[PDB]
Scaffold this active site. Structure first.
Site, PDB file in Angstrom:
ATOM      1  N   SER A  44      35.128  33.335  14.059  1.00 55.20           N
ATOM      2  CA  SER A  44      35.675  34.192  13.017  1.00 55.20           C
ATOM      3  C   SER A  44      37.044  33.765  12.520  1.00 55.20           C
ATOM      4  O   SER A  44      37.514  34.276  11.505  1.00 55.20           O
ATOM      5  CB  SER A  44      35.716  35.634  13.484  1.00 55.20           C
ATOM      6  OG  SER A  44      34.417  36.193  13.378  1.00 55.20           O
ATOM      7  N   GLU A 142      25.122  32.645  11.626  1.00 51.66           N
ATOM      8  CA  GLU A 142      24.694  31.352  12.182  1.00 51.66           C
ATOM      9  C   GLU A 142      25.826  30.390  12.535  1.00 51.66           C
ATOM     10  O   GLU A 142      25.657  29.528  13.398  1.00 51.66           O
ATOM     11  CB  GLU A 142      23.739  30.642  11.217  1.00 51.66           C
ATOM     12  CG  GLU A 142      22.406  31.321  11.001  1.00 51.66           C
ATOM     13  CD  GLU A 142      22.492  32.522  10.080  1.00 51.66           C
ATOM     14  OE1 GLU A 142      23.436  32.592   9.258  1.00 51.66           O
ATOM     15  OE2 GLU A 142      21.610  33.406  10.191  1.00 51.66           O
TER      16      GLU A 142
END
Length: 264
Positions: A44, A142
């Site tokens: 992230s 993904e």
């Protein structure tokens, strides 16, 4: 012999993986580097750079950041708490950017990626600021696979720090956009146990975390404003050899402490 590195080597060995650290004192140019040029999955943490790319675009497009985006349920992704909350009302580009940065909101990240021309578009933005290491290749979720030896969706601690410096302190963004990026990073909610845990309580910190989770893979990067000192920019990334190896926030904080201690 590298004596400065020894505590980092001990730390990663106890962790059971590899830790990558790069820290820059922007006042003196002093650095602390450990595996600084090795690749680690972004996870992230790419969302900070995504927000920066959106801000860059907003400089030339009047009212872009203020533009409401009315997305549907098909845009939602697991762990999109802000996007789900505002599903029935919509969110502005700025609000999506802030959600991506501060709550790691996945739907927000994919929506903004779409606006930028996908992973390739974000990568092109990073190239445009002189980062030749960063690559984003896939979308949420993904991009989090963190497979050992896979260069997809990776960067290096050094390149992360260099790009973060350009965007938050340098001239890669115009001043109003630079400050917005800083404000978003400062309001991050997910990093309390990482770099923030390593810094004196009175110092301002902007950060973005990443947690692929698999392969002991997690990270944090930050800009730190030391009371009465030039800012420090740093990046701490981890990975481990086996799929179910656990990441550790404590290890990230410990590495960040050593980085701050080792800096001129």
């Amino acid at each position: 012999t590298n004596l400065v590195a020894e505590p980092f080597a001990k730390l990663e060995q106890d962790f059971g993986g590899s830790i990558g650290v790069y820290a820059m004192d922007t006042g003196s140019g002093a650095t602390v580097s450990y595996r600084a040029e090795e690749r680690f999955p972004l996870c992230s943490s790419f969302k900070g750079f995504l927000a920066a790319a959106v801000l860059a675009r907003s400089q030339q497009q009047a009212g872009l950041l203020d533009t409401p985006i009315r997305y549907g349920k098909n845009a939602l992704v697991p762990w999109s708490p802000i996007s789900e909350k505002y599903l029935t009302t919509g969110m502005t580009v700025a609000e999506l950017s802030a959600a991506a940065v501060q709550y790691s909101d996945n739907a927000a990240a994919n929506l903004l990626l779409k606006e930028l021309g996908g992973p390739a578009g974000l990568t092109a933005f990073m190239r445009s600021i002189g980062d030749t290491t960063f690559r984003l290749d896939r979308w949420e979720l993904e991009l989090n696979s963190a497979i050992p030896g896979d260069a997809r969706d990776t960067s290096s601690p050094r390149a992360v720090t260099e790009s973060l410096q350009k965007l938050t302190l340098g001239s890669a963004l115009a001043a109003p956009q630079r400050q917005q990026f800083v404000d978003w990073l400062k309001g991050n909610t997910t990093g309390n146990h990482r770099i923030r845990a390593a810094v004196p309580a009175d110092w301002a910190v902007g950060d973005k975390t990443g947690t692929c989770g698999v392969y002991g893979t997690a990270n944090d990067y930050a800009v730190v404003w030391p009371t009465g000192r030039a800012p420090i920019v740093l990046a701490v990334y981890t990975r481990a050899p086996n799929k179910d190896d656990k990441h550790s926030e404590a290890v990230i904080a410990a590495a960040a402490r050593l980085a701050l201690e080792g800096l001129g």
